[PDB]
Amino acid sequence: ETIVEVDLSKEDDAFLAGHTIDGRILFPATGYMTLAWQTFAKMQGSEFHKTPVVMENLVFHRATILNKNAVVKFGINFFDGTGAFEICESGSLAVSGKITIPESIDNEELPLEEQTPSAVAKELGTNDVYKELRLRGYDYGGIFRGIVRSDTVASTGKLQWVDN
Amino acid sequence: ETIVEVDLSKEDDAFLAGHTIDGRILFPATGYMTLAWQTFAKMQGSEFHKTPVVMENLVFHRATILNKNAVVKFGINFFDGTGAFEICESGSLAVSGKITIPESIDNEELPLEEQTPSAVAKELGTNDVYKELRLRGYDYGGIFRGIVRSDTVASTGKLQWVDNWISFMDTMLQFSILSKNLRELYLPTRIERAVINPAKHFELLSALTKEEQVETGLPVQWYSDINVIKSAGVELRGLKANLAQRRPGTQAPPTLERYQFVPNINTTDLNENSEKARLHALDVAIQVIIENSSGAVKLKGVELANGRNPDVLVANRLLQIIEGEPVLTGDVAVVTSNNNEETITAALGDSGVRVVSKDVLKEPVEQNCHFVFGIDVLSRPDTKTLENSIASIRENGFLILEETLPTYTKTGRALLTKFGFVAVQEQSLGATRVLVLARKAVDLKTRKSVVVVATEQNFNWVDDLKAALATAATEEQYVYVVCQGEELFGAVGLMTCIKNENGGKLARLVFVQDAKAEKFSLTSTLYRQQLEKDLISNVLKNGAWGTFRHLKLETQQATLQVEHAYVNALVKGDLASLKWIEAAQADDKNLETCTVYYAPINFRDVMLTSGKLAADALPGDLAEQDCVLGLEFAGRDTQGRRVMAMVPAKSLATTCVASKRMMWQIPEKWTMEEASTVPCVYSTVYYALVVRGQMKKGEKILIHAGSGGVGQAAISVALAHGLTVFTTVGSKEKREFLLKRFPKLQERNIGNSRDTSFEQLVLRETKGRGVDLVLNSLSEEKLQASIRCLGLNGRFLEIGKFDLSNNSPLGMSVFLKNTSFHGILLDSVMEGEEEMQNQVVSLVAEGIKTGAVVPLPTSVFNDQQVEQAFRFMASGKHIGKVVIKVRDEEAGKKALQPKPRLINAIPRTYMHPEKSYILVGGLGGFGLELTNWLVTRGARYIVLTSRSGVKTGYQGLMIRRWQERGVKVVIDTSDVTTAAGAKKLLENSNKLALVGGIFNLAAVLDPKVTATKYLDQFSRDICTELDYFICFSSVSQTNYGLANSAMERICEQRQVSGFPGTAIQWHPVVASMLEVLFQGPHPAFLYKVVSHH
Amino acid sequence: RNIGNSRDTSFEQLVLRETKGRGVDLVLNSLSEEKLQASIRCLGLNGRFLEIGKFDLSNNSPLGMSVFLKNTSFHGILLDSVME
Ligand SMILES: [Br-]
Ligand SMILES: [Br-]
C-alpha cells in the first residue's frame, strides 16, 4: 500500500483546519477523494491536475478526527483489475470506492445547461450562506468558506477558486 | 502488488500440465486459491502450511490457458481494510475473493460425520472415474488423477495425498463434478466458503503411511443438501460450476463406403449422375491397381494432359484416392508436351501434384510408374503416344485409358492387342465413352504353379496355404487359392487374409460363388483369359468375372421428404448448422398433438443456438433432449380447430404436443401469422405486471426495449390499464414506430436504450419522484440506472438474465424505499404448479377481448429460410415477432382438417420403444457406448451378453443411469457360442420384448464366428420383428481375418434369403459412426468405415 | 428440530437439512451481514424474502442477484411507509 502523511503544522496541509465540524476538525470526504485521485495519477505516471478520472461507488465509512498537531498517516491501495481502492487511517478502513481513467472524459459528463436563478426571494451572500450553516453545526473557516453567492433555494450559485 | 511467476519448464510447476481440460492446459482454480493462500501467509510472517485461513466469495472470472513453455505472471493484491484480494494474469482480472486468518480455525468448520457409502451399484475405481470424466472433456493426468475411489453416486470416496495442495483440492472439485447428472464439461465459477486447516490436515495424514496416503487416500464427502465438499483439513461450501465452451474439434465425421461386385466388363454406369459415375470408375481403377501392387507403400502415377484444360485434369482426384488408402502415399505428376508448365502448376493448387515437362511423342514421360492415365490415347493417329506410355510403366504396371466407345471398339482393342496388352477392366462412362484398365498379360503355361483347395471340409487348409507360401518363394512358383461354392468365406475378407500372409504376394484368389462350374483349371477357356490378367482377386458371379470394390457414399447431408421433422442446431457456433431433422413417430393425459403452421423464434432460441446460454439452464430435462427449439406456435388442433399455444420447447417442428391449460382458441379476424405472436410475450407481460407487480391504474411504469416483443406487449397492456408509460428505444426508426402505433404515448417519455440517459429523463419528468414499476431487460450500468428510477413503494421486474447469471451485486439501499425486486422466469410458470398457469392464460384470454392484447408486426420466413430468420433476429433491427411459416394457412380462416405435407429434412432412424436389442459382448467398451446411443434413439429394452458379468464400476454406472432413465437392462451370462445357448438367448429376449435388433461385437477385448452363425440361424425362426443384424469388427492374426470373412458371408447370405444383415468394418468415434450408419437407409451387406479423426 | 441459533450461521445447515435442499417459501429476516447472506441461501424456488432489518439497507450492502434466478422476490418492508 501507499502511505500518505498530512501534517496540519505544515504549510501545505494547514488549510485542513478550516473544515471544522461541530467544534472538531474532520478530514473532508473530498480530502480522501483528492488523495485517492492524486496517488492514482502518481502510479499511472501523470500529474493529477493533468489526469482526468471517474470515481464510482464512493463510500465514507466513518469520520476522521484530527487534533491541532494532526500528524496522520493514510494508507491507500488499488486493484489493477477492477480499479477498486481503499483508504485506511489508524488501522481501520475509512473510505472505499472505484476509480478509472475514462476513454473520453467529455462523454462521461452530462449534457446540462445552467439553470435560471430563482427569483422567489433575495440571493444569499457569503455571510448569509455561512451564517445559516454555522447554525446547523458547520464551523467552516479559511478557504473552506468558498461559497461566494447562492440563490434562495440553492439551485444555482458561485464558488471561489484558490487552487485547491 | 505481489508478482508470482509460474513456468511449466521448471520442476516445481511441471505438475500443472496434468490439469488438462478439453485438450488444453488450464491453471486450476485451486491453483489460484493456493497462490492467494501462500502469499497471504508470507506477508503475515508465517509459513502457509502453518497458517490456517478462510476464503470467502471466491470468483473465478476467466480461465487461464498455459502453453508448453508457459511463462505466465500472476499479480496478487490485498486490502488491509476488508481483506478482499485479487489475482491478475495478463493485465486482466482472473480471480477475486476475501481471505482472513480466523480466531479459531476449529470454530469455523462444520461438525459433519461420514456418510454411509451408496450400494445401489458397484463403486467406481480410479480408472472408472477418469474414464467417465474423459468423456466429459476432462483430460486429467499425473497427480491430478488423485481420485482413488468413489461410490456410484459420488457421495463418498477417497483422495490420495502427494504433498500437493493444488492437486488435492482440485480432486475435491473433480469429485463434486462426478455427482452432476449432465455429462458435460463444467468449470468452477464460484465458491462461497473455503476453510483450510493445515494443522488438522497433517495430524490426520500422520495416521497414514506414505504408501497409504497414495494407495488408499483420504476420505472425501459430498453433502448435497447443504452443498459442502469436505475432506480432511479442507472444507468447501457453496460450489458453483458453469458449463464451458468446447473447442470446435478438428475431428471430421466418419464416412461410409459400401462394398459391391463390379464386373471387369461393366456396361452399366456406377452412378446415375454421369460426373459421379466417372469419379467412381476412377476410384475402382486405382483400387484394382493398389490391390495388385503387392506390398507397395508408395504408388507412382502420371496424367497425360496434351490438348486439355488445366482444370479438368483428374490428377488431384487420383492422388486423393491413393493418399486415402492407409499406410500409402502417392507420387502423382502431370505431364505436358505443350510447355505450359506455369499455367498447369497453378491449376493443381495445394494438392501436391508435381509437374514434369516432356513431349510424350518419341520419349518416355517417366520410369517405373504403377499407372499412366490418358484420354483418347487409342484414338490418336500415331501409336507413339501409346508406345512411350508403355515404356513408362513397370512391367506389371497398368494403363488407365478413357476412350470414346465407337473408336475403342473398331480399332481400340486391336491396338491394345497389337502392343501385347489386355483389357483388364472396361467400365462405361455413359454411352460413347468407356474407361479401360489395361495390363500386359502373363503366360500361365510357362510359370510354375500349385493350387490350394481352401474348403470348409478341410479344417487345416490354412496350414496348407502357409506351407505353400513359404515353399512358393523357394520353388519360384505362384499359389492359386481356389474357393468354389463355400459358405462362411466372404471374398473380401478371405482376400485380405491371404494378402497379409508371409509370401502373400505370390497368391492368387479364385472365388467362384456358383458351385456348378468348370473345375479350376489354367487350360479351361473360362478361366484362362481371366487368370492371364494375373489379378490377385478373381470373383465369378453369374458368369461374369469381377472384384468387390468399395464406393464412396453421397449422403453426407442428403435430404429426404419426411412427414415429421424438427429444427436442430448441429454445431452451436455456426448458425448455418440449423437444419430440419426427421423426428421419431409417436407411440394422453391433459395433452394435445397439434399441427404447427407458425412457429416464432424467441431470444431463448437464439441464445441457446449461439451458445451464450448453456443447456443446464433449460427447464427440466431438456439438456438431454435433441428437439428443444420452439417456445410457442399457432396451428391446428387434433380436431382441426384454430389454436395458438405456449410450450417449454419443441414448437419449432411440423407437430407439437401442447398442454390444454396453456392454449387459446384463435379468434376471428386473426391470421395464424398474427396469433402466433401473442402467447409468450403476453403471458410474460401479464405474469410480470399484473400477477407479480400488481400494477394499478394511474401508476407510472418504465418499460425498457419499447419496440421489442415484450415491450410492445407491455406498453399495450399498461396503457390499457391506464398507467403512465415511459420507454426506451434502440434507434430513430424504433422511436418513430412506437409513437405512431400507440394511444397517448408522449415523446417526452421516450428515452434512449443505448445509454443511461433515460435516468435523467425519467427523474426529470417525474420531478425526482420516479416510477412505481420497472420492467427491465437491460443489464449492468443500465440496470443500476434503472434502479435509480424506482420511486417509493416501487416494484422492480427483472426479465433479463445477464446480471442474474453473473450474480452481479445489488445495492440494497434501494430497499429502504419499501420496494420489491422480482426475478421473473416464465419457464418457472410452465415448469411450476398448475393454478398459476391457468391464471396467466385467463389474463391473456380476458385481455384479447378487451383489446389490450394485439398481435405484433411479423417478419415471416419460410421453412427454408430458418438460418436467415435466426441471423435476422440476432441483428436486432427487427421490430415485433420473428415467425417461421411451416405451413400456409388454409383460406377462410375457419376450422379444417389439414392436408398432408412433406418437408425436406435430414433422415434419421430411431429405435422401437417396444422392442428388445441384444448386444453380444455388450459390456465391453464399444458395447456400452453403443447401448447408450440406442437408448437416446428410443431403445427401452436392452440385453447384454457377458460371460464375466459386471466387472467395472463404470459398467454398473451406465446400467444404473439407463435403469434410472427407465430402461430394462438384462445381463445374460449364458454361453451363446453353442446352438442351445444362442437359441435360449433369443427366446428369452423375445419374451421380454420382441427383438428388433441383434448386434455382434468382435471389437471388444472361432467363438466369434459360431455365435453369429447360430444367432443368424435361430433368429430367422424366433425373431419375426428383427430390423437389424449387424456385425462390428476391424480389418485384418490370420484367424481374425477369417472371422471377418465369415461374418461378411453370413450377412450376405442373410440378405439373399431376405433378412437384414450388415457387416461394419473399421469412445467419441462410436456415436459419430452410428449416426452416419442410421442416417437414412443402408441396405448393403458390407460397409467400410473411414475415420477422419 | 426446527429451532436454530441466531448467534451464528449454523441455522443455514439446519434448515437445508430439514428441507432436503428445497429451502423455505418465505423468510422474515431481522438479522444482518453474514447471517443475512445465509438466510438468502435458505430461500427456495419461488421464495419470497421479507426484510425488516435496517443495517444492510442503510449500509447499502451488496446483494448477489443470482438468488433471483430461482424466480424469487426480495421485499423491503417499512411499516412507516404504510402510515405515511
Ligand atoms: Br466531510
Ligand atoms: Br479449474
Side-chain angles (χ1 to χ4, degrees):
Chain A
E1 65 177 356
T2 305
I3 310 303
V4 178
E5 193 171 335
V6 300
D7 182 16
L8 275 57
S9 294
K10 193 175 71 192
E11 59 188 0
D12 291 294
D13 299 322
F15 74 89
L16 293 169
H19 189 261
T20 300
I21 307 294
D22 196 8
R24 39 186 175 91
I25 300 170
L26 269 68
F27 196 74
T30 63
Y32 284 112
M33 301 171 56
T34 299
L35 293 186
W37 177 20
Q38 283 178 345
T39 52
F40 184 68
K42 196 174 174 65
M43 43 188 64
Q44 289 283 338
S46 299
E47 290 175 289
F48 86 101
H49 57 84
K50 291 281 183 64
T51 311
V53 299
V54 175
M55 305 191 200
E56 296 176 85
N57 194 43
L58 287 164
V59 182
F60 306 95
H61 300 268
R62 56 169 190 74
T64 310
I65 290 55
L66 317 178
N67 301 124
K68 178 162 184 177
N69 50 305
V71 65
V72 55
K73 296 194 175 184
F74 297 110
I76 316 184
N77 203 334
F78 293 88
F79 285 164
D80 287 16
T82 57
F85 76 90
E86 267 187 13
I87 299 169
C88 296
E89 182 272 322
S90 293
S92 69
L93 176 62
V95 176
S96 75
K98 174 180 173 178
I99 189 167
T100 58
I101 294 170
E103 177 73 14
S104 174
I105 184 63
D106 291 326
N107 269 73
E108 295 290 304
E109 308 203 298
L110 292 173
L112 288 163
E113 284 289 358
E114 290 189 51
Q115 292 169 305
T116 309
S118 181
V120 176
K122 253 152 179 49
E123 282 197 343
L124 306 171
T126 175
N127 290 323
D128 299 323
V129 165
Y130 287 101
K131 165 169 188 190
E132 165 62 16
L133 296 174
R134 269 199 303 274
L135 267 61
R136 300 198 199 187
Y138 307 89
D139 306 284
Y140 292 120
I143 61 172
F144 281 102
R145 276 175 64 101
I147 300 174
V148 291
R149 192 164 303 103
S150 168
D151 65 341
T152 175
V153 295
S155 64
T156 185
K158 294 227 157 55
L159 320 171
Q160 60 183 35
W161 174 254
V162 296
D163 194 35
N164 184 305
Chain B
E1 66 177 356
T2 305
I3 310 303
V4 178
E5 194 170 335
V6 301
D7 181 15
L8 275 58
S9 294
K10 193 176 71 192
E11 59 187 0
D12 291 294
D13 298 322
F15 75 98
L16 294 169
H19 190 261
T20 300
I21 307 293
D22 197 7
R24 37 186 173 91
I25 300 170
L26 269 67
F27 196 74
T30 63
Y32 289 113
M33 301 171 55
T34 299
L35 293 185
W37 178 19
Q38 283 178 345
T39 52
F40 184 67
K42 199 173 176 65
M43 43 186 64
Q44 289 284 338
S46 299
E47 290 174 289
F48 87 101
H49 58 274
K50 293 280 184 64
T51 311
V53 299
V54 175
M55 305 190 201
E56 297 177 85
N57 193 43
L58 285 163
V59 182
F60 307 96
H61 299 269
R62 60 170 192 76
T64 309
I65 294 175
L66 317 178
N67 301 124
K68 178 164 184 178
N69 51 308
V71 65
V72 55
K73 300 192 177 183
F74 296 114
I76 316 184
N77 203 334
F78 295 87
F79 285 166
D80 288 17
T82 57
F85 74 90
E86 266 187 13
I87 299 168
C88 295
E89 180 268 321
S90 73
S92 68
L93 176 62
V95 175
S96 76
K98 173 181 173 179
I99 188 168
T100 58
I101 294 170
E103 178 73 14
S104 174
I105 184 63
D106 290 326
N107 270 72
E108 297 290 304
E109 309 203 83
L110 292 172
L112 291 165
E113 284 289 358
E114 290 189 52
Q115 292 170 112
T116 309
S118 181
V120 176
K122 186 166 192 168
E123 79 172 15
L124 306 171
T126 174
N127 290 323
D128 298 323
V129 166
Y130 287 101
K131 166 168 189 189
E132 166 63 16
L133 296 175
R134 269 200 304 274
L135 267 60
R136 301 199 200 188
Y138 307 93
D139 307 285
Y140 293 121
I143 62 172
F144 279 90
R145 277 174 65 102
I147 300 173
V148 290
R149 188 162 299 103
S150 168
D151 64 341
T152 176
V153 295
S155 64
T156 185
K158 293 228 157 54
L159 319 171
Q160 61 184 35
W161 175 254
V162 296
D163 194 36
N164 184 304
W165 290 90
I166 295 173
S167 79
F168 174 82
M169 284 198 291
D170 185 48
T171 54
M172 298 182 63
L173 306 188
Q174 299 178 6
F175 184 82
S176 184
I177 290 165
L178 268 186
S179 55
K180 286 180 167 289
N181 195 339
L182 188 64
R183 309 176 71 192
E184 292 298 335
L185 184 62
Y186 281 101
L187 291 172
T189 299
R190 273 177 278 122
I191 305 177
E192 181 250 309
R193 197 184 205 88
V195 186
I196 306 173
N197 190 339
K200 185 213 211 177
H201 197 76
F202 292 113
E203 75 178 62
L204 284 170
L205 278 165
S206 63
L208 282 71
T209 315
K210 291 289 175 181
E211 193 201 330
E212 289 180 320
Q213 291 171 6
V214 180
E215 306 293 352
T216 295
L218 297 157
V220 60
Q221 306 290 334
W222 163 239
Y223 310 88
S224 58
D225 291 14
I226 60 171
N227 192 339
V228 177
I229 310 150
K230 193 167 179 55
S231 182
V234 185
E235 192 185 284
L236 304 174
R237 314 184 199 178
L239 176 58
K240 299 277 195 298
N242 276 72
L243 219 55
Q245 303 176 2
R246 298 295 297 274
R247 306 170 69 193
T250 62
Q251 300 175 344
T255 54
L256 286 177
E257 303 183 10
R258 71 184 163 88
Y259 279 86
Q260 60 166 104
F261 177 78
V262 180
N264 295 143
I265 312 303
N266 196 18
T267 61
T268 304
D269 292 9
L270 292 166
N271 190 251
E272 168 274 330
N273 177 281
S274 60
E275 179 59 15
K276 271 194 74 67
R278 189 163 171 275
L279 290 181
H280 282 339
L282 293 161
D283 200 329
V284 171
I286 294 295
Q287 277 180 45
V288 174
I289 298 166
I290 293 169
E291 195 168 56
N292 288 281
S293 67
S294 60
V297 59
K298 269 86 177 183
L299 205 71
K300 192 179 190 191
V302 300
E303 162 170 27
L304 305 174
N306 288 339
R308 294 166 61 204
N309 185 37
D311 191 11
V312 298
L313 49 87
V314 303
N316 283 350
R317 183 65 63 188
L318 301 182
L319 180 57
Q320 197 177 323
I321 299 161
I322 298 169
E323 292 280 355
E325 205 71 17
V327 65
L328 186 76
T329 51
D331 175 28
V332 180
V334 182
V335 189
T336 180
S337 183
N338 303 132
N339 300 124
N340 58 338
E341 295 86 7
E342 274 80 22
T343 304
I344 289 171
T345 310
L348 294 168
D350 189 30
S351 172
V353 173
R354 57 205 196 84
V355 180
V356 178
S357 307
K358 283 188 181 296
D359 189 8
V360 65
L361 291 81
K362 259 235 163 182
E363 74 184 354
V365 298
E366 192 143 19
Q367 54 178 34
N368 298 288
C369 297
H370 282 83
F371 68 83
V372 176
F373 178 83
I375 305 183
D376 301 333
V377 177
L378 307 176
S379 301
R380 293 264 72 184
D382 56 46
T383 69
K384 282 166 179 175
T385 304
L386 174 61
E387 267 174 19
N388 292 314
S389 301
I390 295 165
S392 304
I393 56 163
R394 54 188 65 202
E395 196 67 6
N396 53 19
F398 291 86
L399 297 177
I400 311 174
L401 308 174
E402 170 171 339
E403 302 287 332
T404 65
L405 186 52
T407 58
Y408 173 66
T409 303
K410 59 184 177 56
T411 51
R413 290 192 180 100
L415 193 56
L416 288 174
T417 303
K418 173 183 175 188
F419 281 85
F421 273 68
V422 67
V424 172
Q425 286 204 146
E426 286 173 7
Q427 173 58 64
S428 63
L429 297 174
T432 51
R433 284 203 168 270
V434 60
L435 191 66
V436 184
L437 187 65
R439 194 193 209 180
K440 283 188 98 70
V442 302
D443 188 13
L444 298 183
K445 289 160 61 224
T446 57
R447 68 186 198 172
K448 307 187 173 183
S449 67
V450 70
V451 178
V452 180
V453 188
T455 174
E456 73 181 352
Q457 67 185 344
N458 177 22
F459 187 70
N460 296 278
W461 75 263
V462 184
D463 299 305
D464 297 18
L465 180 60
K466 284 181 168 291
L469 260 59
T471 307
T474 305
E475 297 293 58
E476 304 161 294
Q477 56 182 350
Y478 295 86
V479 181
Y480 287 97
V481 189
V482 180
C483 181
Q484 181 165 1
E486 294 294 322
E487 289 67 349
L488 292 175
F489 288 122
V492 173
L494 184 59
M495 189 68 263
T496 305
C497 180
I498 296 167
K499 288 197 289 85
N500 288 274
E501 284 284 338
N502 288 347
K505 57 183 187 147
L506 299 191
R508 304 291 182 271
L509 174 59
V510 183
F511 196 98
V512 181
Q513 298 192 356
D514 199 352
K516 61 211 169 181
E518 293 80 355
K519 303 298 183 179
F520 171 84
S521 181
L522 306 176
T523 66
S524 175
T525 177
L526 172 59
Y527 294 81
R528 196 184 73 98
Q529 192 211 313
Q530 183 63 16
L531 301 178
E532 277 176 10
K533 306 188 181 168
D534 201 32
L535 305 178
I536 64 163
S537 179
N538 303 271
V539 185
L540 187 58
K541 188 179 176 187
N542 289 284
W545 289 107
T547 62
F548 281 104
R549 303 270 63 94
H550 51 70
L551 274 51
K552 291 164 188 55
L553 293 169
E554 181 66 354
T555 175
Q556 64 283 307
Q557 291 291 53
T559 59
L560 294 184
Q561 284 199 323
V562 303
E563 187 178 10
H564 296 308
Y566 69 96
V567 177
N568 187 23
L570 307 184
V571 70
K572 289 176 180 167
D574 193 345
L575 273 56
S577 59
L578 287 164
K579 294 186 175 73
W580 290 89
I581 306 299
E582 187 183 3
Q585 65 175 19
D587 294 327
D588 295 329
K589 303 146 60 177
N590 187 341
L591 305 172
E592 188 75 344
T593 310
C594 303
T595 311
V596 180
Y597 279 67
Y598 289 87
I601 306 111
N602 286 276
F603 281 120
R604 188 185 138 289
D605 296 336
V606 183
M607 292 300 175
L608 185 51
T609 299
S610 68
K612 289 174 69 65
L613 178 64
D616 53 19
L618 299 172
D621 59 17
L622 296 169
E624 299 273 24
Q625 303 284 329
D626 272 328
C627 167
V628 296
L629 301 172
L631 281 170
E632 62 187 324
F633 70 87
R636 291 188 182 279
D637 188 82
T638 295
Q639 200 179 223
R641 288 175 288 170
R642 274 163 63 255
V643 181
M644 39 174 273
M646 181 177 59
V647 286
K650 305 174 174 299
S651 86
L652 190 59
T654 56
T655 46
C656 186
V657 179
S659 173
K660 303 179 188 290
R661 298 186 294 264
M662 283 162 286
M663 287 197 286
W664 307 262
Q665 288 208 24
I666 305 174
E668 195 183 3
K669 295 291 176 296
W670 276 17
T671 68
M672 281 181 176
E673 170 180 324
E674 285 172 25
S676 59
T677 68
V678 173
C680 281
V681 294
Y682 277 102
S683 296
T684 304
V685 160
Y686 274 106
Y687 176 69
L689 304 190
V690 176
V691 179
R692 297 286 290 269
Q694 308 185 230
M695 64 169 176
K696 263 84 177 186
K697 172 175 173 292
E699 290 189 320
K700 306 171 178 173
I701 187 163
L702 174 61
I703 315 292
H704 278 321
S707 81
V710 184
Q712 279 172 70
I715 297 167
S716 182
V717 179
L719 289 178
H721 277 238
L723 281 68
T724 293
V725 173
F726 294 90
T727 61
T728 50
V729 292
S731 65
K732 297 171 65 176
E733 61 173 14
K734 287 161 179 160
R735 179 188 191 232
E736 286 176 330
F737 166 82
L738 277 176
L739 280 173
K740 301 165 183 173
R741 178 165 180 92
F742 284 107
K744 191 162 67 175
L745 208 56
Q746 304 292 325
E747 296 175 4
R748 293 174 61 86
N749 288 8
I750 304 179
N752 179 14
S753 61
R754 282 166 288 180
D755 62 20
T756 53
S757 74
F758 65 83
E759 182 184 338
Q760 287 69 47
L761 180 150
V762 169
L763 293 177
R764 250 193 290 267
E765 292 298 310
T766 57
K767 283 185 161 189
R769 287 276 79 192
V771 295
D772 301 290
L773 311 106
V774 180
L775 184 64
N776 185 45
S777 56
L778 274 46
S779 64
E780 298 179 293
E781 69 284 347
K782 297 172 195 170
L783 190 153
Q784 275 290 7
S786 302
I787 289 289
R788 298 179 210 114
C789 288
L790 200 61
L792 294 166
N793 302 325
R795 297 172 298 288
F796 202 93
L797 311 171
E798 185 59 45
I799 57 170
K801 298 296 179 68
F802 182 82
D803 293 280
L804 266 53
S805 304
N806 194 72
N807 187 45
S808 299
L810 178 69
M812 291 179 67
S813 69
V814 63
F815 295 116
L816 282 167
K817 304 183 184 180
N818 201 40
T819 49
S820 315
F821 198 102
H822 290 273
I824 295 157
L825 290 68
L826 177 52
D827 293 337
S828 297
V829 179
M830 304 183 286
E831 183 181 3
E833 302 305 321
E834 290 75 6
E835 179 53 26
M836 195 58 248
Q837 295 163 0
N838 287 312
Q839 179 60 250
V840 295
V841 299
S842 304
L843 262 52
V844 176
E846 184 184 12
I848 298 170
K849 52 173 68 185
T850 305
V853 180
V854 179
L856 281 60
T858 55
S859 307
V860 189
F861 298 83
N862 56 26
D863 51 346
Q864 296 302 337
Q865 303 159 348
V866 179
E867 177 183 342
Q868 298 304 314
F870 272 76
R871 289 188 179 281
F872 181 75
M873 187 169 186
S875 64
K877 62 178 288 184
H878 69 96
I879 294 178
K881 200 60 136 188
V882 181
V883 191
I884 289 171
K885 177 209 295 177
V886 184
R887 300 174 59 103
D888 279 305
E889 182 179 359
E890 290 80 351
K893 61 181 72 178
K894 302 160 66 184
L896 174 62
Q897 197 68 24
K899 307 161 177 56
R901 282 201 189 191
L902 294 173
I903 184 169
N904 295 274
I906 297 169
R908 175 167 294 187
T909 309
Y910 300 84
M911 294 307 110
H912 199 297
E914 298 181 347
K915 293 187 176 182
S916 57
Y917 296 92
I918 303 164
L919 290 80
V920 184
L923 281 180
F926 193 101
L928 294 172
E929 300 309 311
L930 172 54
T931 301
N932 194 48
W933 186 90
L934 295 166
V935 168
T936 62
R937 282 288 175 106
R940 291 291 178 276
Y941 296 92
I942 297 294
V943 183
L944 309 173
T945 75
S946 182
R947 301 305 307 274
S948 52
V950 180
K951 176 188 171 188
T952 74
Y954 183 75
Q955 280 161 7
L957 175 57
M958 292 306 304
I959 296 168
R960 185 176 67 77
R961 290 181 169 161
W962 295 329
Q963 285 177 327
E964 286 178 353
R965 281 191 275 176
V967 176
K968 176 68 182 181
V969 187
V970 174
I971 310 297
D972 191 319
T973 187
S974 73
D975 181 22
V976 64
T977 63
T978 67
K983 184 169 173 292
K984 193 197 173 190
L985 174 71
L986 296 171
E987 276 170 355
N988 289 134
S989 297
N990 214 38
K991 291 296 178 70
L992 180 63
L994 299 178
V995 180
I998 293 173
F999 306 86
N1000 299 88
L1001 312 179
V1004 300
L1005 203 53
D1006 292 338
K1008 300 178 289 298
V1009 174
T1010 54
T1012 308
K1013 179 176 181 174
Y1014 287 143
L1015 285 169
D1016 164 34
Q1017 173 179 345
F1018 293 111
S1019 62
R1020 295 180 190 204
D1021 301 328
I1022 302 162
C1023 309
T1024 50
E1025 296 277 309
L1026 177 130
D1027 300 297
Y1028 310 110
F1029 190 100
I1030 302 175
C1031 303
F1032 296 93
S1033 54
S1034 183
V1035 182
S1036 60
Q1037 281 296 111
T1038 179
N1039 274 99
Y1040 193 81
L1042 284 168
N1044 286 347
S1045 179
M1047 287 184 182
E1048 289 169 10
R1049 199 71 168 100
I1050 292 174
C1051 294
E1052 186 186 26
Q1053 286 292 85
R1054 279 181 61 88
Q1055 286 203 18
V1056 169
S1057 301
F1059 287 109
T1062 315
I1064 306 300
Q1065 288 177 359
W1066 285 77
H1067 304 71
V1069 296
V1070 174
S1072 298
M1073 175 268 287
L1074 292 167
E1075 182 188 18
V1076 172
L1077 182 48
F1078 290 91
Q1079 181 175 173
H1082 284 72
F1085 71 83
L1086 178 60
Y1087 285 98
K1088 196 174 183 287
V1089 184
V1090 184
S1091 291
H1092 302 287
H1093 318 134
Chain C
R1 294 177 62 85
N2 288 9
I3 304 179
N5 179 14
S6 61
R7 281 163 288 181
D8 60 19
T9 55
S10 73
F11 66 83
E12 183 184 339
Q13 287 69 47
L14 181 150
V15 170
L16 293 178
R17 249 191 288 268
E18 291 298 310
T19 58
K20 284 185 161 189
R22 287 275 79 192
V24 294
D25 303 291
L26 310 105
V27 180
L28 184 64
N29 184 45
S30 56
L31 274 46
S32 64
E33 298 180 293
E34 68 283 346
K35 298 172 195 170
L36 190 153
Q37 277 159 32
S39 302
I40 287 289
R41 299 179 211 120
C42 289
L43 201 61
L45 294 166
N46 302 326
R48 297 170 298 289
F49 201 88
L50 311 171
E51 185 58 45
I52 57 169
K54 298 296 179 68
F55 182 83
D56 293 279
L57 267 52
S58 304
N59 195 72
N60 187 45
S61 299
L63 178 68
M65 291 179 66
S66 68
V67 62
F68 297 118
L69 283 166
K70 305 181 185 179
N71 201 38
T72 50
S73 315
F74 196 102
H75 289 273
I77 296 157
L78 290 68
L79 178 52
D80 293 336
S81 297
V82 179
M83 303 182 286
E84 182 180 3

